[PDB]
Design an enzyme around this catalytic site. Sequence first.
Site, PDB file in Angstrom:
ATOM      1  CG  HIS A 284       2.828   3.219   3.845  1.00 12.87           C
ATOM      2  ND1 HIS A 284       2.170   2.065   3.379  1.00 12.87           N
ATOM      3  CD2 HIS A 284       2.424   3.262   5.286  1.00 12.87           C
ATOM      4  CE1 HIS A 284       1.727   1.447   4.201  1.00 12.87           C
ATOM      5  NE2 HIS A 284       1.569   2.064   5.418  1.00 12.87           N
TER       6      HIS A 284
ATOM      7  CG  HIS B 120      -2.061   5.410   5.523  1.00 14.63           C
ATOM      8  ND1 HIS B 120      -1.512   4.137   5.563  1.00 14.63           N
ATOM      9  CD2 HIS B 120      -2.065   5.813   4.405  1.00 14.63           C
ATOM     10  CE1 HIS B 120      -1.256   3.865   4.411  1.00 14.63           C
ATOM     11  NE2 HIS B 120      -1.226   4.957   3.483  1.00 14.63           N
TER      12      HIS B 120
ATOM     13  CD  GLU C 298       1.845   3.067   8.786  1.00 17.14           C
ATOM     14  OE1 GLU C 298       1.466   1.761   8.598  1.00 17.14           O
ATOM     15  OE2 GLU C 298       1.550   3.823   8.263  1.00 17.14           O
TER      16      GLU C 298
ATOM     17  CG  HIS D 129      -3.825  -3.275   5.362  1.00 14.19           C
ATOM     18  ND1 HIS D 129      -3.634  -1.758   4.862  1.00 14.19           N
ATOM     19  CD2 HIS D 129      -4.871  -3.610   4.723  1.00 14.19           C
ATOM     20  CE1 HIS D 129      -4.387  -1.699   3.903  1.00 14.19           C
ATOM     21  NE2 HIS D 129      -5.060  -2.702   3.745  1.00 14.19           N
TER      22      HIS D 129
ATOM     23  CD  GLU E 257      -2.571   1.093   2.601  1.00 13.72           C
ATOM     24  OE1 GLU E 257      -3.887   1.458   2.677  1.00 13.72           O
ATOM     25  OE2 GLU E 257      -1.940   0.722   3.936  1.00 13.72           O
TER      26      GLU E 257
ATOM     27  CG  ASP F  37       0.474  -1.408   6.250  1.00 14.65           C
ATOM     28  OD1 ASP F  37       0.903  -0.619   6.948  1.00 14.65           O
ATOM     29  OD2 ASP F  37      -0.793  -0.883   5.602  1.00 14.65           O
TER      30      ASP F  37
ATOM     31  CD  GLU G 212      -7.640   0.327   5.060  1.00 11.24           C
ATOM     32  OE1 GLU G 212      -6.684  -0.155   5.791  1.00 11.24           O
ATOM     33  OE2 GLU G 212      -7.419   1.576   4.484  1.00 11.24           O
TER      34      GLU G 212
HETATM   35 ZN   LIG Z   1      -2.296   0.067   5.554  1.00  9.28          ZN
HETATM   36 ZN   LIG Z   2       0.662   1.605   7.093  1.00 10.32          ZN
END
Ligand SMILES: [Zn+2]
Ligand SMILES: [Zn+2]
EC number: 3.5.2.10
Lengths: 257, 257, 257, 257, 257, 257
Positions: E34, E176, E181, E118, E32, E43, E120
């Site tokens: 970032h 995010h 992170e 992650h 994904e 992730d 989701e």
């Molecule tokens: Zn993610």
């Molecule tokens: Zn992430």
Amino acid sequence: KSVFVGELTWKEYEARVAAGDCVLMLPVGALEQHGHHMCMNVDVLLPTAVCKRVAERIGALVMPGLQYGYKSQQKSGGGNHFPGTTSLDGATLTGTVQDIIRELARHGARRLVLMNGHYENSMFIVEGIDLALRELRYAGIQDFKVVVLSYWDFVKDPAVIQQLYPEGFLGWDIEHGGVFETSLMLALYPDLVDLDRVVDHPPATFPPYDVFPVDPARTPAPGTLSSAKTASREKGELILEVCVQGIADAIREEFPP
Amino acid sequence: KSVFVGELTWKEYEARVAAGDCVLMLPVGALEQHGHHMCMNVDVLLPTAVCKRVAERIGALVMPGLQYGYKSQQKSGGGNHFPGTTSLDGATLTGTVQDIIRELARHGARRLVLMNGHYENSMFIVEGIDLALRELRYAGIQDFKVVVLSYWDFVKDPAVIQQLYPEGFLGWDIEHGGVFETSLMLALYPDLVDLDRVVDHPPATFPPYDVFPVDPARTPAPGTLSSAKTASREKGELILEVCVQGIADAIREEFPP
Amino acid sequence: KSVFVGELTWKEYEARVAAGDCVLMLPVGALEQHGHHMCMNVDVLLPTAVCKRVAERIGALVMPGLQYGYKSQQKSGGGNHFPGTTSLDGATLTGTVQDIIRELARHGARRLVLMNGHYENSMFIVEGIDLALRELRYAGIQDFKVVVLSYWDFVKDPAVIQQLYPEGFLGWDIEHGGVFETSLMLALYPDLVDLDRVVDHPPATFPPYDVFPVDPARTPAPGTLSSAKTASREKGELILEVCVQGIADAIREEFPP
Amino acid sequence: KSVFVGELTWKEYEARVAAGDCVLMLPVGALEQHGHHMCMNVDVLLPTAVCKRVAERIGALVMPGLQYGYKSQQKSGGGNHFPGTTSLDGATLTGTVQDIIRELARHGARRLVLMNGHYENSMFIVEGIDLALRELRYAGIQDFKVVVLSYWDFVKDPAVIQQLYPEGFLGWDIEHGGVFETSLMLALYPDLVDLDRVVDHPPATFPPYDVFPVDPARTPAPGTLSSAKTASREKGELILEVCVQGIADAIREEFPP
Amino acid sequence: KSVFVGELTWKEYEARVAAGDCVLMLPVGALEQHGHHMCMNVDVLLPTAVCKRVAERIGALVMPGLQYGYKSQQKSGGGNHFPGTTSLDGATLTGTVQDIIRELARHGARRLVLMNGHYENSMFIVEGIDLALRELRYAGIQDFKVVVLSYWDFVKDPAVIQQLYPEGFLGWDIEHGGVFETSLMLALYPDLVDLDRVVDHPPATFPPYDVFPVDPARTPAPGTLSSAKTASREKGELILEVCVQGIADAIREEFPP
Amino acid sequence: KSVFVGELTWKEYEARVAAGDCVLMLPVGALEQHGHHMCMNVDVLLPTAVCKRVAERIGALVMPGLQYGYKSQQKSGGGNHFPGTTSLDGATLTGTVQDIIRELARHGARRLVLMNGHYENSMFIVEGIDLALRELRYAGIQDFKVVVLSYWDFVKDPAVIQQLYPEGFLGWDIEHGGVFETSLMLALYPDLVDLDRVVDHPPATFPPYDVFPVDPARTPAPGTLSSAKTASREKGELILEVCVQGIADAIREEFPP
Ligand SMILES: [Zn+2]
Ligand SMILES: [Zn+2]
Ligand SMILES: [Zn+2]
Ligand SMILES: [Zn+2]
Ligand SMILES: [Zn+2]
Ligand SMILES: [Zn+2]
Ligand SMILES: [Zn+2]
Ligand SMILES: [Zn+2]
Ligand SMILES: [Zn+2]
Ligand SMILES: [Zn+2]
Ligand SMILES: [Zn+2]
Ligand SMILES: [Zn+2]
């Protein structure tokens, strides 16, 4: 008395399963182009004919065959882009095998031979078997046994191989619409073969990788992967006896009386 | 020249589709108990035989038949608890029909007749068609047309009905293994019927509801829903002509040259 | 005290199931066009109202109904091409029934009546039941029983039919948006019917086959398969009393207190 | 004129879609335990009531609600081990949403509000939307727009939050069967709530992880995640207006005349 | 000795499971976007690194991580319209989790920690777990226990949050590619982060609803939902120790020796 | 600059795709027993390392690898009854490949190489590709091309084989955990191989059929199908040079600049 389940009454079938060691056989084929010289139901006809002969010899029963198989692949069948070839999705084929096993088990059957006649079906048959056996295990059933085979793998005798492939064994994949299937067809269903229409081309060769979408140019024009020029009724009888004998012996070993 | 696609080469098939108005026919049957007096592949044999005769008259082609259909229901087929009956899940049957239609469309075909021979298949055939037609639309194809029918529905003539059922018509659902199918089998495949084994029970009756799990006591022991005692080759011949003529006319009307 | 599971607390529900003989009822309908004179939720409203009355009489409980059903078919509901009609795929409907049975069994329930209000749902209900019972069997559970019925099958009595159809009854095949449903609606939800908007066309007739894509010309323009001109509140009251009594009796027979 | 699609005729619905800017709304609920003091259909009743009121204000229509939702999770609904709670598998809910969007698109509708009333449904609704839109793109449709929301998220005003939660807001996940839903029910369906039966336990707390199989001891006995003791009709009327006003405005912004 | 199952021989793994209390850990991530300053495998990398450290401390083993996760959602990961993000359908992810649990149970394992990285993924992990536990229950197995957690939920201590966010904390719904992170990445894989490329925008805000198809204008251009300008190695080292300690403790509590 | 997509930012990835001829590579492996002397992630590690080297040479990018593959089969990988081996169902693997292709296509990518490291994956990879290409066609996309290859098909040369197998080469069918894989591992990840633990058994042979459930006696006890006794780092270095060169050449041929 017929060896075909479809030709029996339910009482006759019930009695045979009741006997305790009944072996059932299921031919798994395809509707697939087989060149200019042969019809498209070969992969159903051939395993069905071998199952019939094997069953007669060992006292087994043969189920209605699967008529449609997995998508033709260029290296083993020419490719699914040809007209006539009518193929199932993997999930569909897998599900059909799975449902059939579930039902045979409901009947009380515990011995099944899946006889494949179309190169591309194998892994979907395997998944169908696994999913069915998984479900049986949910109900505490662990004594259902399956033997799966492609009938050509039983032709191993050097003496026989040399006759068919005097110039070297070409692999069972390249054997699509070639000497092996054509000879069997000449022996069993000669009206469905016209040897004069065979396009004699050099055996197909392919790179060490696959490309999708399939490039039609990489398949010989007729759809065959090797030439059936030298096919013969005599070769067919030889193949038939070797297959029938070897499979019967194998089934007797795996499913003893 | 065979009317069966499986007995054609891929070139012959391609040429037939290339001609423009080619009609394809797909028999959809089952492997199902049919009493003590008839074999279990009736539902494949009958619609396939009707397809053949219709195809011969109108110049259509017949695809390999579906050998396994949906689960037998008590009020139309005795119930899925019988030995021998080997049934698919709805999703499997639907997926098979869907895959075949996709492939025929790929071939360039646009006219399909689905001839059902097993009572319980209908709605899963219907769903298969809908999902296939939905996909064709995604691919920009809107000219694929399908006719679906169960062959017995063409026997409507009151006079014919009385010839077949002098004591009254009791519905196509109760006609499982009875006078209609048995008469057709006597006409087409007499070696697969033994009229002397018929059990002459009164027509099955059921309450206006269904119970699951299926209770076997509510089905006549032989598995038939009505008696084939008065079945005859002559009745079979009459049915055959009425079905073949009626269906031929319907297809000509829906798929004109 | 409500007969609707949705109107109970979980404690009240638990106690009712704890009695050991609790019958649950599930209405299964559709959102479907029903002519110019009636609203589109008829197939939910009607079985729900019948369920309510039966449950009151026999001490049963009614689950939230299925509001969406299988694709409307020309010969039964006019066809899925009409606006407003909102249909599920077969797998979706089958899965919904299957999930609900799984959950009811988890609760300890073992008696279920599915009351169908939309003809087209029938075979998907059957498959959902089969898959759910299959899963219960995996868990050694075989005492979950399901009764499936359509409320219209309980208007059997020729004397009742004579009262409802004094000018002759032309059959159940055309009762989509006709006298039967409209009369029930006039009795139960008169504000959802406007009898003056009824288009008084002749009964729909069809050939013994179906065509897809569906040809809209074959359905009467208003969407009804028969005229509701003679529908009345009194006819609806009669149908209601007869259906409720008949169903209550059938359920007491299959699921004794 | 009703705002419910189910209470319209197909002609009335067709005309409303033909207008060009028609907004459709679909309540998505559940059948789920809601403690000792409230019934189990709350998650259907509440978004349906909110949809009705929004629809009245903005000239929208409301589709039959989804009655069954995703499995109750311990931290947001007590857990799916409770009696009464009747949950769908994720694929079932996803498919139901997918089927409905496909059908609405067929009707010519291009504007849909999915109003969720059950905390656990959200991601399955999202997947259903994504799969439906993917399919629409295949058919060349890219102008279908969906707004999805959980109605409680519109209660944002700190002044409202403080009226409901003077001691502090702990989250919508622990709001199951507590002050928010109970107040709304007291205002809309008072006969379905009995405040005297509220068990007044301290708000449920959980560690920063989840355990499966779900452990019942980690949920307050009554099934509520927080006490509804301070619930009131007045608070319900406040919540109702805030949600209806907010959602109406939001929809006017996203789906302008 | 390695804590990674992939780095063990089958004999080593067998022996570890044979000891009786073996804890297995499965990282579940995503590919994904970032932002402009960080790589796309975050992730996966982060939960894997946390798993490694926890496993070292408690004597657990770590399975190969799930590399691809569920579709990115606007409000949590920016949206699935970004390049690079490569997402699975819900059914795919659910099935993957389900298959792995089935297989672990077959080995004789009974303790599993799923560590999500992650946002989701959560509900699809939940469904996978449920479907696998359902299958095990068919075989009478009820001792397979799963702990599921998102590693960031263990950074709870306001004292810790105060340390990480001294100017003020803005919430988890925007983390995010933000401070959390990025700091972890600075501590663990500094070569995969370039703080100089951070695009310093204000925290993303959204209305209390979602729109599909996703509108890119509603996500900050760089793809982050909050600025990582103040991220640091020191913050990362604090997050790491807190997460590792917290998770090790939780696992020891749920899966004691 | 890394060749791994996971190690790039979304902008860097976007720019590479925007260049117009970007080739993406996907390793597809398994977690599977590989004897007493080697770890279980071999089938992931090996194609990933080959992909890395090929990508470095030709300017391609490598996607995160599939860590879990199809069920191990006796004749190729020893069988799925071994501990440690953790396998997906066919549908799961097929779906994963399908989802990844759909997403890469969304990014604008049009050139994909799948490098299989686990023989059993092959047909599920094929189905995944076909299903993804089918969908792309629905969306108007016909220029997405996929090349599938197993790295071991590039060690064709008999001169290389002679060098690698001076005591004679027995075939590829027994190369699970034997000289080929073990030599490659000694070259790349020597700490993951302990040659002293090799069990030097006679090469595995099998009858021309398969049996399910799998009979463990038919697999050599250690799980290898041939002995890796003569494996060496040097053999591995040669295999690596030969495979990388050949694969790079093939990709440049199929996907020119
Ligand atoms: Zn993610
Ligand atoms: Zn992430
Ligand atoms: Zn062949
Ligand atoms: Zn073939
Ligand atoms: Zn029949
Ligand atoms: Zn039948
Ligand atoms: Zn109706
Ligand atoms: Zn209806
Ligand atoms: Zn609620
Ligand atoms: Zn809820
Ligand atoms: Zn390997
Ligand atoms: Zn392998």
